[PDB]
Amino acid sequence: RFLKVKNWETEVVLTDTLHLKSTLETGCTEYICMGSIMHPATKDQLFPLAKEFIDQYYSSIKRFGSKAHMERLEEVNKEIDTTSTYQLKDTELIYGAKHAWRNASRCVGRIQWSKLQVFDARDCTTAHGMFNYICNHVKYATNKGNLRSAITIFPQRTDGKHDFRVWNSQLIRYAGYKQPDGSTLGDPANVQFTEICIQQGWKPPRGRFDVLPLLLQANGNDPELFQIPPELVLEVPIRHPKFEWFKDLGLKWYGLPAVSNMLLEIGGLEFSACPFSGWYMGTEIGVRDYCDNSRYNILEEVAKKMNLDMRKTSSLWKDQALVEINIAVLYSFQSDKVTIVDHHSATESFIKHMENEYRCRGGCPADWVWIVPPMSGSITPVFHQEMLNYRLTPSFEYQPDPWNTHVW
Amino acid sequence: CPRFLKVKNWETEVVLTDTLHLKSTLETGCTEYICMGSIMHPDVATKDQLFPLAKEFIDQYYSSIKRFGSKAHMERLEEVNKEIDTTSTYQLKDTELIYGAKHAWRNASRCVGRIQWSKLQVFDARDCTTAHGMFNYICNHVKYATNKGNLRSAITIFPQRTDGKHDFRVWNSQLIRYAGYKQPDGSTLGDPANVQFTEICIQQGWKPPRGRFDVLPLLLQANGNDPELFQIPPELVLEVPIRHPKFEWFKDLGLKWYGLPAVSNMLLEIGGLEFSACPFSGWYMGTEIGVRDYCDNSRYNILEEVAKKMNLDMRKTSSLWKDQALVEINIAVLYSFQSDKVTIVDHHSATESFIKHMENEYRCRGGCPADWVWIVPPMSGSITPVFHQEMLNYRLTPSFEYQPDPWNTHVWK
Ligand code: HEM
Ligand code: HEM
Ligand SMILES: CN(C)c1ccc(CCNCc2ccc3ccc(N)nc3c2)cc1
Ligand SMILES: CN(C)c1ccc(CCNCc2ccc3ccc(N)nc3c2)cc1
Ligand SMILES: C[C@H](O)[C@H](O)[C@H]1CNc2nc(N)[nH]c(=O)c2N1
Ligand SMILES: C[C@H](O)[C@H](O)[C@H]1CNc2nc(N)[nH]c(=O)c2N1
Ligand SMILES: [Zn+2]
């Protein structure tokens, strides 16, 4: 059946047919919703996935059933038949990557989906090569502050024994350190990976914002350590437009958000290493990285300098300190000519994107739990937007951290 | 289905295991290939249909009270059965009904205040026959629940649906709400939410004051007759003028709200029986008023005005002038209710208490259905503990259900 979604502030109702195209399971059943749960090949398996992907490729370019289509199908079959896998054409790789982004139910920045610089790194064979490709990515994507969306794609998985993996969760992330007293210096989310790096020979400065090094694994081999040239790492000192004491807090963050731990699945093929990068929505930094209890956890300190009444929770002193911090972040990146979107602008763009997608594509999978920003929820349009969620392919999936499987 | 489902809290790392979901009764709207978790909403029963529903419930009751398989249990089954054979329905004892109402609350996956579920004063109004009697019962509800501002949760239960042609209904969505009036210029006065019901009221003969906070009259249907209008005694309606602990100008906004949230349009389903008029009340979470009632664009929509008075730069959105005003408004709401000693809970306290509730439910009950989309407060989500808490959502019965608005279905006499 067709399904309607309503926006309760504007009363707009879109009709969803696209959901009928999916085959992967969301996790829910008719009796149990898991919408707030974070995580709910052979030749025989490989061809239909290949065939479905090529079919939608040639359908997207309005040449379905054509000679090129037929031959390509024959070509891919004849290759899986004799190699137990197949290689994507350059065209398919780019279409595939942009469509994985287009299909990411959790991404509020999808209005940018078709503007994506794809770097083919399928000829890479070593970690040194990986470091080269990654360094080129960062310099390109950063672009002196005028960030650009990029993705660098390393060889697809073969037997599982020879995966390319980027061990860092993001190409640029700060170190975290378990102190003697049991506290954490720096970013607590990275304490494990920070220790693995040190175990491998990395000499840590042991400060609050130390850039982690790259840990790259090629062809299933032991991973290797590489320092990103500091000139390639754009960072922003966080200050406040009215509060001149905010710089005293000693806050900074990096400009490039570049996720490196995911798995890009195309046409039945698995790219275990596909670090991609966009730009920030301020709350990522302002709300989550800085204020989460398990993260930098600065709320109390900020509210102290704000001299707020902190005895009872009903002074909303946390809510006060929160808005001010996120103002600082947006003010800093802007003042430094580094690309950054606030959550009002971002969510609006997403609504506008949704309407585009419904009109041209008959739907748009969207994960309300993730789309709604972690602050000021209902004063953004997305809060009032009914969304449907389903899994379309190609896509970005999660994968085991490498240090749980890899044998040295 | 899997018999053991795990949920994690990513802030504390606590994992809980859910087994209660196995006793799920109705469809959620979701399937294996699609999730409807952000969808707001995704002629009677018969003899053969009612037996399993009643027995299911009765078994559950005698289970709670540790008398399962007893003489009293088996006799109650025999009595309910015979009643359904001979009258096509059955009547709940006063104990079964109270249990039932408390558990519909306990089962409410969308409700962040369920830690209070066991403290619910239940008024049995099954002897009601007229609209005037409904109004009597409803006035008594309000006075007791209000309690001079030290509010107490309560429910009044009217006779159950029988053949569908004699339903009791409260046409109000809440017993206390403000009128909305559509002007010929397109602008609305009062509360945009209640414009349709306000119009219905004027049709039925209400002479509206036509102001910004005018308490709606009650529209009451008993036994399937046409509804009748009654004015709630003003002395029974506790209100709070909204002011700010720091901004003197905030009182000049002329803002007030009522103390008692009193939802009156849900259906209460217990053991296959349908109580189409079951007004219930609790007390407010601050955000309901400060964020939703006040700042929603389709509602009172005061953000711009509050921002103007805060002298905020409102050209660009990245100044966060909206977020700045929203917090202040919510501080004022909380500050006012507390100053007038009217019970109210901030979103930090409530979400925090619900986590404790949820954990205890997993412990003593094997689970606790919850709607993350609804539980997480509409402001500062990630800085409350429920944002980080994985929840499973599913429908247990007894339950509060939605039902069509009565003017859509009522055959006028
Ligand atoms: C261009 C500007 C972009 C913006 C403003 C943006 C915004 C966001 C935000 C705010 C999230 C929430 C993630 C979190 O809270 O941890 C997200 C998630 C996500 N984004 Fe985008 N993004 C952008 C670019 C991209 C690109 C270039 C890709 C891939 C090619 C992408 C794919 C994804 C995926 C797969 C997720 C899911 C995250 C997860 O599963 O953990 N985004 N995005
Ligand atoms: C005692 C204090 C209570 C608090 C703080 C509380 C809190 C809340 C809040 C904040 C909501 C969201 C409402 C909305 O966003 O529109 C809600 C929903 C709900 N509550 Fe509670 N609640 C309380 C009492 C009760 C009681 C006494 C009952 C019934 C006996 C109840 C049953 C429900 C139900 C069925 C919903 C779903 C609302 C809907 O579907 O529209 N609650 N609660
Ligand atoms: C494994 N777990 C629990 C877990 C998995 C993913 C996350 C979120 C990681 N994704 C962050 C992320 C991913 C892609 C992005 C794209 C653009 C952007 N501005 N931020 C972005 C941020 C958190 C926890
Ligand atoms: C028909 N639609 C679109 C619609 C349905 C329900 C809602 C939410 C109404 N729920 C209100 C409600 C219900 C129970 C409550 C219990 C306690 C409390 N403080 N507020 C409470 C508030 C909004 C729109
Ligand atoms: C339990 C819940 O699913 C988890 O906390 C989610 C909630 N929504 C989120 N939304 C975004 N954008 N990012 C997140 O990490 C999360 N975390
Ligand atoms: C579209 C979305 O499902 C809708 O706006 C919901 C979201 N969560 C909510 N949560 C609460 N508590 N109350 C609401 O009215 C809503 N509205
Ligand atoms: Zn679901």
Side-chain angles (χ1 to χ4, degrees), chain B residues 236-265:
Chain B
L236 285 187
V237 188
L238 180 60
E239 281 177 319
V240 172
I242 310 307
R243 63 258 193 222
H244 194 280
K246 297 292 193 64
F247 298 143
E248 264 287 353
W249 50 260
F250 201 98
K251 56 149 167 301
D252 298 331
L253 292 185
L255 296 177
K256 65 179 157 186
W257 205 253
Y258 43 93
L260 183 84
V263 166
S264 66
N265 66 12

Side-chain angles (χ1 to χ4, degrees), chain B residues 106-348:
Chain B
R106 188 189 195 175
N107 289 344
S109 72
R110 290 177 170 178
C111 173
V112 65
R114 274 179 287 165
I115 199 184
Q116 289 278 356
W117 79 264
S118 79
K119 280 147 288 167
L120 181 68
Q121 177 70 22
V122 172
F123 306 112
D124 187 347
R126 293 175 290 162
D127 67 346
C128 198
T129 63
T130 82
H132 290 256
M134 288 183 72
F135 168 80
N136 191 25
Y137 270 108
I138 288 177
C139 284
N140 288 356
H141 181 128
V142 169
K143 197 191 196 189
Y144 166 88
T146 294
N147 190 29
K148 298 189 185 284
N150 182 30
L151 320 177
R152 305 177 281 195
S153 60
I155 181 168
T156 296
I157 306 175
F158 289 112
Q160 68 219 39
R161 169 167 300 145
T162 46
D163 56 5
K165 299 177 181 187
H166 299 72
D167 296 344
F168 291 61
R169 289 298 297 271
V170 180
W171 287 35
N172 311 78
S173 53
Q174 294 178 37
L175 297 179
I176 308 196
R177 286 210 95 171
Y178 293 132
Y181 312 88
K182 202 52 171 252
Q183 304 309 91
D185 72 347
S187 67
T188 310
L189 176 46
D191 189 336
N194 306 311
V195 157
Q196 206 198 335
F197 172 85
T198 293
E199 294 175 345
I200 288 171
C201 280
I202 302 152
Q203 180 175 4
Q204 297 306 291
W206 187 51
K207 317 254 176 335
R210 295 189 174 267
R212 199 185 178 189
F213 306 101
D214 303 344
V215 179
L216 285 152
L218 297 164
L219 243 195
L220 304 185
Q221 159 182 322
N223 206 44
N225 293 291
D226 300 336
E228 307 162 20
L229 286 174
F230 299 85
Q231 188 194 23
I232 294 154
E235 68 263 22
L236 285 187
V237 188
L238 180 60
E239 281 177 319
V240 172
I242 310 307
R243 63 258 193 222
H244 194 280
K246 297 292 193 64
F247 298 143
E248 264 287 353
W249 50 260
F250 201 98
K251 56 149 167 301
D252 298 331
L253 292 185
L255 296 177
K256 65 179 157 186
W257 205 253
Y258 43 93
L260 183 84
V263 166
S264 66
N265 66 12
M266 293 196 90
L267 185 142
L268 160 66
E269 188 265 339
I270 300 161
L273 304 178
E274 306 196 285
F275 300 91
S276 44
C278 57
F280 61 82
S281 70
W283 53 77
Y284 265 116
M285 187 157 78
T287 57
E288 293 182 76
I289 308 181
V291 187
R292 307 305 315 287
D293 292 322
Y294 280 176
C295 298
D296 271 23
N297 279 311
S298 73
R299 296 293 303 286
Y300 279 94
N301 193 28
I302 66 173
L303 264 193
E304 172 150 315
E305 196 193 350
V306 171
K308 280 193 160 76
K309 297 206 157 200
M310 290 191 68
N311 281 303
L312 296 172
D313 183 294
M314 301 159 57
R315 270 162 300 176
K316 20 87 76 71
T317 94
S318 59
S319 60
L320 305 193
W321 65 266
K322 280 196 181 165
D323 316 54
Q324 288 194 277
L326 182 62
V327 178
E328 296 302 325
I329 288 151
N330 274 276
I331 291 169
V333 159
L334 285 166
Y335 173 66
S336 306
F337 270 66
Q338 286 172 357
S339 303
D340 289 3
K341 290 198 157 61
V342 178
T343 303
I344 188 181
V345 63
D346 69 78
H347 52 280
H348 295 291

Side-chain angles (χ1 to χ4, degrees), chain A residues 70-322:
Chain A
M70 292 172 120
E71 257 165 333
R72 180 77 185 119
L73 289 185
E74 140 86 358
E75 186 180 25
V76 171
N77 186 75
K78 215 181 184 101
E79 184 176 358
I80 303 171
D81 203 320
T82 62
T83 64
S84 317
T85 178
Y86 76 106
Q87 301 292 316
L88 300 168
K89 303 294 186 179
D90 288 336
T91 47
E92 293 149 6
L93 187 73
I94 300 155
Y95 168 90
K98 299 184 169 186
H99 271 75
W101 187 7
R102 198 184 186 177
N103 297 338
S105 302
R106 299 179 160 168
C107 179
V108 82
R110 274 179 291 163
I111 199 184
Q112 286 282 330
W113 75 268
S114 68
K115 282 163 232 174
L116 176 72
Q117 178 60 36
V118 182
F119 296 113
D120 192 352
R122 276 178 305 170
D123 58 346
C124 201
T125 71
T126 81
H128 272 86
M130 293 178 77
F131 168 78
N132 185 246
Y133 271 105
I134 277 147
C135 269
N136 289 341
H137 180 119
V138 169
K139 178 173 211 143
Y140 168 86
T142 302
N143 189 32
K144 301 189 178 304
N146 180 19
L147 314 183
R148 304 184 280 206
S149 294
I151 186 169
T152 294
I153 306 167
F154 296 101
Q156 72 215 32
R157 163 167 299 159
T158 18
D159 49 358
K161 320 189 187 311
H162 307 88
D163 302 355
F164 287 70
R165 289 294 293 281
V166 182
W167 286 35
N168 319 63
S169 62
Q170 286 161 50
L171 310 170
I172 298 181
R173 254 248 166 122
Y174 297 109
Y177 306 92
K178 278 295 299 185
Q179 291 297 103
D181 62 278
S183 63
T184 288
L185 175 64
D187 194 335
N190 301 126
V191 184
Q192 189 176 16
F193 174 79
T194 295
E195 288 172 6
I196 291 178
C197 286
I198 299 170
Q199 174 266 315
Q200 286 303 125
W202 182 60
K203 346 277 188 190
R206 283 203 156 89
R208 209 174 165 206
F209 302 87
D210 309 350
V211 171
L212 282 170
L214 294 174
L215 241 194
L216 310 176
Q217 149 187 351
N219 202 72
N221 286 286
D222 292 347
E224 302 169 32
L225 278 178
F226 298 94
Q227 173 208 41
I228 304 179
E231 78 251 31
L232 298 188
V233 180
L234 181 63
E235 299 190 288
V236 175
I238 314 303
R239 63 277 194 188
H240 197 269
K242 288 85 178 299
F243 299 148
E244 293 192 39
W245 50 253
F246 204 101
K247 58 172 176 300
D248 305 330
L249 303 176
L251 293 181
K252 70 166 72 182
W253 203 258
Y254 51 90
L256 190 64
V259 164
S260 60
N261 55 11
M262 299 200 71
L263 182 131
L264 164 55
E265 186 264 332
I266 304 186
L269 302 179
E270 286 178 0
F271 301 97
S272 43
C274 54
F276 61 95
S277 70
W279 55 81
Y280 267 115
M281 184 169 84
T283 51
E284 295 191 68
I285 303 168
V287 181
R288 307 297 307 286
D289 300 313
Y290 277 163
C291 293
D292 278 12
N293 267 331
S294 45
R295 293 312 293 288
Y296 272 95
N297 195 23
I298 70 176
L299 268 177
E300 179 169 322
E301 180 179 358
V302 184
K304 283 175 176 177
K305 293 263 210 152
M306 299 187 52
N307 278 301
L308 307 180
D309 192 17
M310 294 167 65
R311 301 181 228 88
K312 286 190 181 176
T313 65
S314 47
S315 68
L316 306 200
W317 62 266
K318 289 195 182 179
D319 308 74
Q320 281 187 269
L322 184 71

